[PDB]
Design a protein around this motif. Structure first.
Motif, mmCIF file in Angstrom:
data_model
loop_
_atom_site.group_PDB
_atom_site.id
_atom_site.type_symbol
_atom_site.label_atom_id
_atom_site.label_comp_id
_atom_site.label_asym_id
_atom_site.label_seq_id
_atom_site.Cartn_x
_atom_site.Cartn_y
_atom_site.Cartn_z
ATOM 1 N N UNK A 140 37.608 37.435 32.068
ATOM 2 C CA UNK A 140 37.913 37.593 33.490
ATOM 3 C C UNK A 140 36.758 37.159 34.386
ATOM 4 N N UNK B 137 32.552 32.771 40.749
ATOM 5 C CA UNK B 137 32.362 34.202 40.923
ATOM 6 C C UNK B 137 30.930 34.499 41.354
ATOM 7 N N UNK B 138 30.757 35.655 41.986
ATOM 8 C CA UNK B 138 29.508 35.973 42.660
ATOM 9 C C UNK B 138 28.429 36.404 41.674
ATOM 10 N N UNK C 146 35.279 47.623 39.659
ATOM 11 C CA UNK C 146 36.281 48.673 39.783
ATOM 12 C C UNK C 146 37.437 48.363 38.839
ATOM 13 N N UNK D 273 40.434 46.931 39.479
ATOM 14 C CA UNK D 273 40.788 45.537 39.716
ATOM 15 C C UNK D 273 39.759 44.959 40.674
ATOM 16 N N UNK D 274 38.995 43.983 40.199
ATOM 17 C CA UNK D 274 37.933 43.374 40.988
ATOM 18 C C UNK D 274 37.556 42.053 40.336
ATOM 19 N N UNK D 275 36.577 41.379 40.927
ATOM 20 C CA UNK D 275 36.031 40.150 40.373
ATOM 21 C C UNK D 275 34.724 40.479 39.664
ATOM 22 N N UNK E 253 35.773 35.295 46.099
ATOM 23 C CA UNK E 253 35.439 34.217 45.179
ATOM 24 C C UNK E 253 36.626 33.282 45.002
ATOM 25 N N UNK F 188 38.465 33.774 41.243
ATOM 26 C CA UNK F 188 39.469 34.821 41.076
ATOM 27 C C UNK F 188 40.773 34.451 41.770
#
Lengths: 115, 109, 156, 120, 145, 251, 102, 263
Positions: free
Chosen positions: B17, B22-23, B68, B70-72, H177, H180
């Motif tokens: 995932x 992404x950060x 969390x 659901x998060x990135x 992002x 995602x």
């Protein structure tokens, strides 16, 4: 107007407990756990009824429950307010005890606080 | 956008995932992004970049986090910079200094 | 008749806009080559249980997507899974097909795991026999309730 | 409204606009989060209220889905001036739910369960 | 224009009745005579204004306001309770979750004494309790794990 | 760019004069009543006929997606949210720009080509105060009322459809309506409706008063009126939606 | 399908699965007074393609999908499957229902 | 009356449909001219881009609305990574077809109604009948062919711009992002939904063009009546588009919702 409790507490048409022959019971709960009207009354986890009013008389919450015809409940039925799902609704379970009695709940009968 | 920031290569045993773009966080503050993710043998090679304004210790540990339910998922460089040698550009992080989230399947098992 | 060379300019610019829009929507937004199966070979897997896997669920190699599940159908010994995998990814022949769930709300997928990460590679149309499925929530809840209800609380 | 400040070791998933509350009731929001060396300076507003220079600021998880918020416990008789900075030693970071799951699962995965049952 | 005036008046009356019904439904407007009580909490834990006050689970009023007292050490909650419902000297209060999203409500338990609490009183912090405080629960698992 | 800028300046000047006449000169009760009833009768049945299937479609989509998600008890929540924040104002935008704005533009173009505007002007009467002001006020009033009706009818239709077709729970619907909707949502909906009605009336009146006559002038005027109203109302809706979600109920 | 209790979060439209793969959907749930005791009766509308695959001795479980999600009916192949295949006239029973969070 | 009115519009639509092959084999140049006119607008609206620009702006607005409201609500709840997937299921299903249909109705349908009403008033329909030329085949069938040819590129551009607007609003204005968003979008979007939506839009465009050509062909009352024709045609187009999308979505996803997340 005076008794207006919101759009969640208005008795809605349709569903079990609204057809002819449905019986009306009074359930004296200790606390309703923020239950709303038009909640599901479940016998054996089957949606078989609806709760009409949750009025509070002499500081003990009494629920008016409509159940569909064709369900037999012993006079010592156990009523229990529970949660349907973690991110979901609540309901009132009407389950028979381990020693059901011969007599049955008629229309207008009351489930006391002990049960 | 090249040469304005610092690019780091990190090898992970599993990259779930986590996607390019992404950060990247330092102490919970966004400092960059992730360039690419490609399989390298039994590992996963992830190339990411962080802004050249910030400094990162040479012995940093890039950990993938699931903030969390659901998060990135984000790559966070856990030890904040306090001095000493700094993470130079083009450095390689092996599996010995990287971390991955717990995953829900492992919890259930 | 007509051919005013001003209508022709409108026609050609509209055709160019149409072609650009269709190509961009089909390649970068809808991924028609992936939906059809261009440049992708077919693979199969056998599962003791589905584990909730569905069609269009991602096929992953250590979490990175390298394909998509085409069909999941019940069988006599479990479930049969047919998937498409991009031809650029070659997976080892000694891999396992693990059904996984991304989070606690859903999004099932299938991961192809190979500890060796090398050796002989699967050929198109093959089948993976070794598979695993996560522990179901119902059994875990039942086990928790049983293991907590037996404890004598008065003795506690 | 004046903007106050604080020093934290980690934002703990905090976002701009997350609530700042005193004694459980909302007083302000979060305005900025800047990396200042070893600490994270989180600016916030108190809605015109006054807190002591010895107040304690704690980032905490509010709901299971991952909403964070700052709690303030005012202490001391001195009054914190606007743009005041709380010490890093008067601020604490939360224990993440994913950290808890990671800890319990990685610890329980190493157990020799047969030995534990035999010992009991 | 008389008939047009009547038609416009009737149609506007009905549609403004619908608009006001929308406001009543989505603004939680009540039309019952209430009484104003107060209660002191060490921590209200996300209680807001306009959230419900329920007597043994049955809604009886709404929360008026919350404000810090004792230099931010405590929070005083001023709320409403239906005039037909008398509180008592041992009538305790609590703050209960409504869902896992962040909505709360006030919960009143009758107690045991029959001494009527006079209207406008204050329930002391000795018999008021906060909500779950999930962060404390999650952080309490740290030494165990 | 010079011609569109000049037309925009003319529209702004006409709206400024309309506001000055509204706040200075006496109001026209008769023309306001007549235009209100006209706009009601031209955009009442289409309003319901567009709102009911649209809200049924949205409720169906929401219910099926949530049931697949597993959390079908919150079906009411989203059901309220969009229906107060998007469905109401957007149905109002469509049925107002299509019906009332076009009707006003056509009526004023008819008066212009028949030289009734010049007939008013030679008697010393300013056309704006006598015609445009009651038309704009009526448009705003009608848009407000129609937005309210759209929201109410959409909510009731969604409830009935979901309960009597997709077997969702009525209690889980009516008790989650207020979960994500409150005073901010109804307030931003009212603001959207009033602004949409005002803008639609202004554009319709301005295009009607500047009709080109001839044989295709009124049709072109109505078409341009409709396109301008659609574009302007969508832009205003986007801006107002951003502003309203800044003061969101969940935050 | 007969069971002692239907299970919460089990409403019409819940997926019916064999080996975990959906094969149908639940149609209705009713309360039947069997030997002076209420029991849950579930009517399942299943595509008859997979009936030839399900043995008569299949185990029925009213399992749960996730902690937040709803329940589903699962059919499983037993250790000694019967050569007969189930149909509308074969009564079947549920081995167990997963415990509720209550 | 009512039955006779329905019979009149039924006769008109039958006559327009049956003459499509004749227009295709004999009026190719007229079809190309109408295709260019519809794709690049006419009058004062052709300098700003025509129908393409209006469709683009309205679809960008709708996608922005979806992304804004969805991200706001999901961030308030907490599960805000789903926005991407949510955005997809908002565009293809209920928003993009209906909004593209209404914008196409407005622009092209009102333009066609105005043109046909102007020809009816200017007695060019009578001029066509005098030269022994099928008026309905020359005008309405050519309009229908041009609309059917032009709807697919227009709806493709509308879908592309709605997706682009939702993605840009989510991943730039709200700083989510891109990875995602792209993952959830490309995972929870089915091309089958897009193809069936395209079929819905083609059917809807044919119905809209039929309705607008009917209102423009039988115009009356001089130049004043053309405006009332446009207004009535627009109301009918709104109703027809909404009904078409509702019926198609009810038929397609009535039993199989074509969406799976849980086990």
């Amino acid at each position: 107007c005076g008794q207006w409790r919101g759009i969640a507490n208005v008795p809605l048409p349709g569903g079990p407990g609204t057809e002819s022959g449905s019986m009306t019971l009074y359930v004296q709960m200790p606390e309703t756990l923020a239950l709303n009207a038009n909640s599901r009354v479940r016998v054996r986890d089957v949606f078989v009824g609806r709760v009409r009013k949750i009025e509070l008389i002499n500081w003990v919450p009494t629920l008016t429950v409509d159940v569909e015809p064709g369900i037999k409940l012993p006079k010592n039925t156990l009523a229990k307010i529970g949660q349907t799902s973690l991110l979901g609704s609540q309901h009132v379970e009407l389950n028979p005890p381990e020693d059901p009695s011969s007599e049955l709940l008629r229309d207008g009968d009351t489930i006391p606080l002990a049960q | 956008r090249k040469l304005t920031n610092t690019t780091v290569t990190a090898y992970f045993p599993e990259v779930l995932a986590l996607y390019p773009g992404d950060k990247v966080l330092i102490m919970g503050v966004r400092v960059g992004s992730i360039d690419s993710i490609e399989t390298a043998g039994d590992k996963m090679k992830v190339v990411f970049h962080f802004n050249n304004k910030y400094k990162v210790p040479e012995n940093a540990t890039a950990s993938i986090l699931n903030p969390s339910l659901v998060a990135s998922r984000v790559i966070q460089l856990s030890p904040p910079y306090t001095g000493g040698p700094t993470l130079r550009d083009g450095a390689v992080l092996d599996v010995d200094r990287t971390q991955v989230p717990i995953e829900y399947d492992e919890v259930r098992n | 008749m007509l051919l005013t060379r001003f209508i022709k300019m409108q026609l050609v610019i509209f055709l160019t806009l149409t072609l650009v829009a269709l190509v961009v929507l089909a390649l970068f937004y809808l991924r028609l080559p992936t939906w059809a199966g261009l440049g992708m070979y077919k693979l199969n897997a056998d599962l003791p249980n589905s584990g909730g896997l569905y069609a269009t669920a991602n096929v992953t190699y250590r979490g990175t997507t390298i394909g998509k599940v085409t069909s999941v159908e019940p069988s006599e010994s479990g479930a049969r899974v047919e998937m498409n995998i991009y031809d650029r990814y070659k997976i080892p022949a000694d891999a396992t097909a693990n059904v996984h769930s991304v989070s606690a709300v859903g999004e099932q997928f299938i991961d192809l795991t190979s500890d060796s990460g090398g050796g002989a590679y699967f050929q198109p149309g093959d089948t993976i026999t070794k598979a695993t499925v996560p522990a179901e929530v119902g059994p875990a809840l039942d086990a928790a309730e049983k293991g907590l209800a037996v404890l004598p609380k008065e003795k506690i | 409204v004046p903007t106050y400040y604080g020093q934290f070791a980690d934002t703990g998933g905090l976002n701009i606009g997350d609530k700042v509350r005193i004694a459980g009731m909302d007083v302000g929001n979060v305005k900025s989060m800047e990396i200042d060396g070893d600490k994270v300076v989180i600016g916030y507003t108190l809605g015109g209220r006054t807190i002591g220079t010895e107040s304690r600021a704690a980032i905490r998880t509010d709901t299971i889905l991952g909403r964070k918020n700052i709690e303030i416990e005012p202490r001391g008789s001195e009054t914190l001036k606007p743009r005041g900075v709380l010490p890093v030693g008067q601020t604490s970071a939360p224990y993440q739910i994913y950290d808890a799951f990671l800890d319990v699962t990685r610890n329980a995965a190493g157990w020799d369960t047969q030995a534990v049952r035999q010992s009991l | 224009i008389k008939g047009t005036l009547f038609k416009l008046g009737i149609f506007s009356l009905v549609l403004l009745t619908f608009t006001a019904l929308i406001f009543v439904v989505f603004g939680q407007i009540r039309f019952n005579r209430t009484t104003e009580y107060s209660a002191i909490f060490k921590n209200v834990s996300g209680l807001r204004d306009g959230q419900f006050v329920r007597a043994a689970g049955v809604e009886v009023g709404k929360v008026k306001s919350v404000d810090l007292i004792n230099g931010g050490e405590q929070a005083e909650v001023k709320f409403t309770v239906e005039r037909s419902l008398p509180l008592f000297q041992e009538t305790t209060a609590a703050i209960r979750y409504q869902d896992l999203i962040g909505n709360r409500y006030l919960e009143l338990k009758r107690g045991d004494s029959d001494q009527i609490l006079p209207p406008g009183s204050t329930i002391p912090v000795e018999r008021t309790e906060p909500a779950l405080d999930l962060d404390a629960l999650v952080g309490g698992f740290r030494p165990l794990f | 760019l010079e011609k569109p800028l000049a037309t925009v300046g003319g529209f702004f000047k006409m709206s400024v004069m309309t506001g000055k006449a509204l706040f200075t000169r006496p109001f026209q009760w008769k023309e306001f009543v007549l235009q209100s009833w006209f706009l009601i009768r031209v955009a009442f049945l289409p309003t319901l006929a567009v709102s009911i299937p649209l809200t049924v479609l949205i409720i169906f989509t929401l219910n099926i997606l949530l049931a697949e998600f597993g959390a079908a008890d919150v079906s009411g929540a989203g059901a309220a949210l969009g229906a107060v924040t998007q469905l109401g104002p957007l149905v109002t935008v469509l049925v107002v720009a299509g019906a009332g704005s076009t009707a006003i533009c056509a009526d004023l173009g008819a008066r212009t080509v028949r030289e009734e505007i010049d007939a008013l002007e030679v008697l010393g009467i300013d056309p704006i105060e006598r015609l445009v002001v009651p038309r704009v006020v009526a448009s705003t009033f009608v848009a407000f009322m129609l937005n309210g009706a759209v929201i109410t009818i959409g909510l009731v239709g969604g409830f009935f459809f979901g309960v009597y077709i997709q077997n969702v729970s009525a209690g889980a619907y009516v008790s989650t309506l207020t979960l994500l909707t409150g005073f901010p949502e109804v307030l931003i909906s009212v603001v959207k409706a009033t602004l949409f009605g005002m803008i639609a009336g202004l554009v319709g009146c301005y295009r009607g008063l500047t009709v080109a006559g001839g044989s295709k002038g009124v049709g072109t005027a109505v078409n341009e009126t409709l396109v301008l109203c659609v574009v302007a109302l969508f832009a205003v809706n986007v801006v107002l939606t951003t502003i309203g979600v800044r003061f969101g109920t969940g935050r | 399908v007969l069971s002692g209790r239907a299970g919460l979060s089990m409403d019409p439209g819940s997926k019916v699965t064999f080996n975990g793969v959906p094969i149908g959907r639940l149609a209705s749930i009713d309360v039947v007074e069997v030997d002076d005791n209420p029991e849950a009766r579930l009517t399942l509308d299943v595509d008859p393609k997979y009936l030839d695959l399900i043995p008569e001795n299949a185990n029925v479980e009213l399992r749960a999908t996730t902690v937040f999600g709803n329940k589903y009916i699962s059919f499983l192949s037993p250790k000694n499957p019967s050569a007969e295949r189930l149909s509308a006239s074969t009564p079947i029973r549920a081995q167990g229902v997963t415990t509720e969070f209550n | 009356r009512f039955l006779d009115s329905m019979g009149h519009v039924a006769w008109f639509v039958v006559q327009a449909i049956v003459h499509v092959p004749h227009a295709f084999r004999h009026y190719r140049r007229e079809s190309l001219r109408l295709v260019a006119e519809i794709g690049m607008g006419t009058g004062a609206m052709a300098v700003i881009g025509g129908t393409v620009a209006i469709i683009g702006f309205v679809t960008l607005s709708a996608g922005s609305l979806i992304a804004i409201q969805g991200f706001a609500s999901l961030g308030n709840i907490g599960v805000e990574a789903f926005t991407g997937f949510f955005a997809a299921l908002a565009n293809i299903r209920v928003v993009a077809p209906v909004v593209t249909g209404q914008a196409l109705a407005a622009t092209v349908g009102a333009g066609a109604t105005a043109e046909l009403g102007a020809m009816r008033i200017s007695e060019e329909v009578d001029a066509l009948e005098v030269m022994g030329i099928k008026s309905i085949s020359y005008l309405v069938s050519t309009r229908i062919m041009a609309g059917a040819i032009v709807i697919i590129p227009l709806y493709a551009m509308a879908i592309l711009l709605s997706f682009m607007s939702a993605q840009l609003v989510t991943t730039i204005f709200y700083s989510q992002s891109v990875g995602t968003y792209e993952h959830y979008f490309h995972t929870f979007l089915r091309v089958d939904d897009v193809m069936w939506s395209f079929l819905e839009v083609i059917i809807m465009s044919v119905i809209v063009m039929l309705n607008h050509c009917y209102f423009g062909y039988f115009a009356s009352g001089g130049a004043v009546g053309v405006g009332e024709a446009v207004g009535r045609s627009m109301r009918t187009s709104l109703i027809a588009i909404v009904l078409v999308v509702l019926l198609a979505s009810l038929a397609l996803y009535g039993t199989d919702p074509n969406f799976n997340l849980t086990v």
